Design a protein around this nucleic acid. Structure first.
Ligand SMILES: [Mg+2]
Ligand SMILES: [Mg+2]
Ligand SMILES: [Mg+2]
Ligand SMILES: [Mg+2]
Ligand SMILES: [Mg+2]
Ligand SMILES: [Mg+2]
Ligand SMILES: [Mg+2]
Ligand SMILES: [Mg+2]
Ligand SMILES: [Mg+2]
Ligand SMILES: [Mg+2]
Ligand SMILES: [Mg+2]
Ligand SMILES: [Mg+2]
Ligand SMILES: [Mg+2]
Ligand SMILES: [Mg+2]
Ligand SMILES: [Mg+2]
Ligand SMILES: [Mg+2]
Ligand SMILES: [Mg+2]
Ligand SMILES: [Mg+2]
Ligand SMILES: [Mg+2]
Ligand SMILES: [Mg+2]
Ligand SMILES: [Mg+2]
Ligand SMILES: [Mg+2]
Ligand SMILES: [Mg+2]
Ligand SMILES: [Mg+2]
Lengths: 63, 107, 153, 397
RNA sequence: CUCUGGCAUGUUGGAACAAUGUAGGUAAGGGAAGUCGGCAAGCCGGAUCCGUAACUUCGGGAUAAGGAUUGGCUCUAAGG
RNA sequence: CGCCGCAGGUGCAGAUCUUGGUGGUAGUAGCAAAUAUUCAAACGAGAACUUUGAAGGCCGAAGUGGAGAAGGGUUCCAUG
């Protein structure tokens, strides 16, 4: 539907960027009916919203 | 029949020859789309995201020369769409392109 | 309300109009002149051919600066275009006309566009910004359209 | 006032409406003058531009610096399979010019000729000349036809033969044939009419039309360049680097007071695709094609009696953007208008060749058949693979 | 050039790749003959080691001018 | 409104007149500063442009990032 509020709010409760918030493309309805923190927190605890790992900037070459 | 599946190789190099640097991979995708339409006859071809990744694998201006795709005309009796046959285009990874024919693959 | 050119038989005719439509008046008038006189099935298939760019609308009066097309040799002329918005507005009005015809109970497979005209509507006013602190008009050219179909085979 | 420094006219005014040609073939527009003392012959032919190469010959020009020395000259190859005469038209000269009196066609006209008669052969029923060959096979139509022949004999002054090329022998995509009127010269009208109706429905080779080392004229359509500006189209001088509204212009188009742009100033427009008629093109060699006596033979092409190899006129990898020559060809000296695959009218000269530059018998020493698809360095495949020895693919084979 | 963070190409898209443009390149052989005028473009360029003239207010000029070297890899000395 | 009298802010083609309206131009010029988008799905009557996922990219810490002062005044946030 439209998950801008959920993306912003998940970035808030996960302390990262919206580029790092991953929303489940299959559970779009269960994400879309989450208009609050603690609903975002429940979704994080059950793994429908995931913080993505940082893209690697290695130092092996310069080392 | 109409639930048919074949495997082709596409010379993206000759289909892409001459186009600008910032347009080569999108041009390659609509060339693949036209190729699939003409090898089948169906509009509503659907390009697989792995095929999109394979086309865009070396960025926007160094598109692979030959790609190996699998075309499959399949039934559309899951939406009430005006055409009963769509075509899914998937991506077949290979090592060499030598002696590679167009091949009908089984069910 | 009050059509120009009332028909010969207001029991075998059906009519439809539309006012203050945001399509270009010049493009819709050329499309209307191309559509005039046709049978209803031929007119619908033709307008869908226009929107798929398989058949052109020949621009005969409002033709200044209009490019040349190989599809105008059917309507033997040199300038033609493919007015998409005009085609879809005329298709909406044509299907409203066939709905009126089936409502008043006529054979819809034998209707012919006997009358169609496009009038200018009141202009709606926007702005554009110019070089030395000037503001120029950015008007739109909407149109009223009316048509009368007639049962004849 | 007074343009202050003399410079000649840019470009020629004898060549303009500088527009696209209305034809693709190339109209003759002037055949050689007729004298009935000569034998009966044709005066033109229709070939196709294959490509270019170069030759080596020894020059016999007394007093010249290259006397009895070997030179290298560029040549153009024109593929000329024999033309089929399928019709005959007669002309009577009137005080309004010269009008066509009567055409007679032949029975059994070929499908590429009928392809010329149609604009869409795919959707047609191919019905052309069916009622005509009916009157050929009939007997009431037959006496009508000989009556037309006799009327043409007693009234016409100029007869021409309608002949088409046979495109099934060419490497081209085009299956539609090219028709042409070729004037028949040298005799009385009765003599040339019975000669042409003898040659009706029949093949005529370029060996019979033209000859060795004569000078002919080439008529064709110049290679097409599209919409060009005045610098490419008329070769006017480019304006200096600090010119505000463009450099590649003509800075002044006429004075104030003829008050109009004249027709003789340089303007932008179409360059190329122009009908040109170039003269004095010397024939260097007439080829012989790919005949089959046994296990066949292609040395009758470029084997020049000083190399004695077994190579054809074709380079390695064939002629670029053309294909390969398997028919009778004509090797002309120099360059020739048009693209590759462009059809060339070739016709006999209408001057008289009394010049020591002309009337000269040539003799080729060498014909270069290296690849034109790059900087090719081998003449034949045998020479290449003998120089290189076995390769990796040959070894695994 | 990349990470964290951010974005969707700066008020539209599609198809072609003519002239004329605007911006950017390249060019045989000549080398300012171009032009009011070397305008514009080009040449040179960092660092290390040499070597630097007239003139001078003795401070400078001065990076004057001019020349050589410069990568990768494997070591050896010296400097706490 | 006609006739007899009476009284005028009493007759327009112009004034680069004034105010208002409408043309041709013309479906024309134009929607070209700062590298770039693409595939699939969802919602929806309707998707080049919304949202989600994947890819390819850019800003590249003197940022197209995170916060403030002037200034703005509700533009903030949800829903439609
Ligand atoms: Mg104009
Ligand atoms: Mg503006
Ligand atoms: Mg301003
Ligand atoms: Mg003079
Ligand atoms: Mg200036
Ligand atoms: Mg070459
Ligand atoms: Mg851009
Ligand atoms: Mg955009
Ligand atoms: Mg903006
Ligand atoms: Mg140079
Ligand atoms: Mg040089
Ligand atoms: Mg100079
Ligand atoms: Mg000078
Ligand atoms: Mg000078
Ligand atoms: Mg300068
Ligand atoms: Mg000095
Ligand atoms: Mg070294
Ligand atoms: Mg007054
Ligand atoms: Mg007035
Ligand atoms: Mg007046
Ligand atoms: Mg325009
Ligand atoms: Mg524009
Ligand atoms: Mg970057
Ligand atoms: Mg900030």
């Amino acid at each position: 539907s439209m998950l801008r509020l959920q993306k912003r709010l998940a970035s808030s409760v996960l302390r990262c960027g919206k580029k790092k918030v991953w929303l489940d493309p299959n559970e779009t309805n269960e994400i879309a009916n989450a208009n609050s923190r603690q609903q975002i927190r429940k979704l994080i605890k059950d793994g429908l919203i995931i913080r993505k790992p940082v893209t690697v900037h290695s130092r092996a070459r310069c080392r | 029949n109409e639930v048919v599946t074949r495997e082709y190789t596409i010379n993206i190099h000759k289909r892409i020859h001459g186009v600008g640097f910032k347009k080569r991979a999108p041009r390659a995708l609509k060339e693949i789309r036209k190729f699939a339409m003409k090898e089948m006859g169906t509009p509503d071809v659907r390009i697989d995201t792995r095929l999109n990744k394979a086309v865009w694998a070396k960025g926007i201006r160094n598109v692979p020369y030959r790609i190996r795709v699998r075309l499959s005309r399949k039934r559309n009796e899951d939406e009430d769409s005006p055409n009963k046959l769509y075509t899914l285009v998937t991506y077949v990874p290979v090592t060499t392109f030598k002696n590679l024919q167009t091949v009908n693959v089984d069910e | 309300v009050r059509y120009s050119l009332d028909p010969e038989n207001p029991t075998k005719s059906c009519k439809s109009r539309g006012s203050n439509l945001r399509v270009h008046f010049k493009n819709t008038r050329e499309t209307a002149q191309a559509i005039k006189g046709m049978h209803i099935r031929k007119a619908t298939k033709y307008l869908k051919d226009v929107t798929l760019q398989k058949q052109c609308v020949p621009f005969r009066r409002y033709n200044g600066g209009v490019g040349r097309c190989a599809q105008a040799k059917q309507w033997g002329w040199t300038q033609g275009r493919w007015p998409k918005k005009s085609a879809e507005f005329l298709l909406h009005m044509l299907k409203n006309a066939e709905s009126n015809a089936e409502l008043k109970g006529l054979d819809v497979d034998s209707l012919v566009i006997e009358h169609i005209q496009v009038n200018k509507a009141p202009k709606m006013r926007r702005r554009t910004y110019r070089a030395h602190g000037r503001i120029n008009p950015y008007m739109s050219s909407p149109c009223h359209i009316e048509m009368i179909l007639t049962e004849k085979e | 006032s007074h343009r202050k420094f003399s410079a000649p006219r840019h470009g020629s005014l004898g060549f303009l409406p500088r527009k696209r040609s209305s034809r693709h073939r190339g109209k003759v527009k002037s055949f050689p003058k007729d004298d009935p003392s000569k034998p009966v012959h044709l005066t033109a032919f229709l070939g196709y531009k294959a490509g270019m190469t170069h030759i080596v010959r020894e020059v016999d020009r007394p007093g010249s610096k290259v006397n009895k020395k070997e030179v290298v000259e560029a040549v153009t190859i024109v593929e000329t399979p024999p033309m089929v005469v399928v019709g005959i038209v007669g002309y009577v000269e009137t005080p309004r010019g010269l009008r066509t009196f009567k055409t007679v066609f032949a029975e059994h006209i070929s499908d590429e000729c009928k392809r010329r008669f149609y604009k869409n052969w795919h959707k047609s029923k191919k019905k052309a000349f069916t009622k005509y060959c009916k009157k050929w096979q009939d007997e009431d139509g037959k006496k009508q036809l000989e009556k037309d022949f006799s009327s043409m004999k007693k009234y016409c002054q100029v007869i021409r033969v309608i002949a088409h090329t046979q495109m099934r022998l060419l490497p081209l995509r085009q299956k539609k044939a090219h028709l042409m009127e070729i004037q028949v010269n040298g005799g009385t009208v009765a003599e040339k009419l019975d000669w042409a109706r003898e040659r009706l429905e029949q093949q005529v080779p370029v060996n019979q039309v033209f000859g060795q080392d004569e000078m002919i004229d080439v008529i064709g359509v110049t290679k097409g360049k599209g919409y060009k500006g005045v610098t490419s189209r008329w070769h006017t001088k480019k304006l200096p680097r600090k010119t505000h509204r463009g450099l590649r212009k003509v800075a002044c188009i006429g004075a104030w007071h003829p008050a109009r742009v004249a027709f003789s100033v340089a303007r932008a427009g179409q360059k190329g695709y122009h009908h040109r008629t170039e003269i004095n093109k010397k024939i260097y060699k007439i080829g012989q094609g790919y005949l089959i006596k046994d296990g066949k033979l292609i040395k009758n092409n470029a084997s020049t009696d000083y190399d004695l190899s077994d190579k054809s006129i074709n380079p390695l990898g064939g002629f670029v953007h053309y294909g390969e020559v398997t028919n009778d060809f004509v090797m002309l000296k120099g360059c020739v208008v048009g693209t590759k695959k462009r059809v060339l009218t070739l016709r006999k000269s209408l001057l008289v060749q009394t010049k020591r530059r002309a009337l000269e018998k040539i003799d080729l020493k060498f014909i270069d058949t290296t690849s034109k698809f790059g900087h090719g360095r081998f003449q034949t495949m045998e020479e290449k693979k003998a120089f290189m020895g076995p390769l990796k693919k040959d070894r695994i084979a």
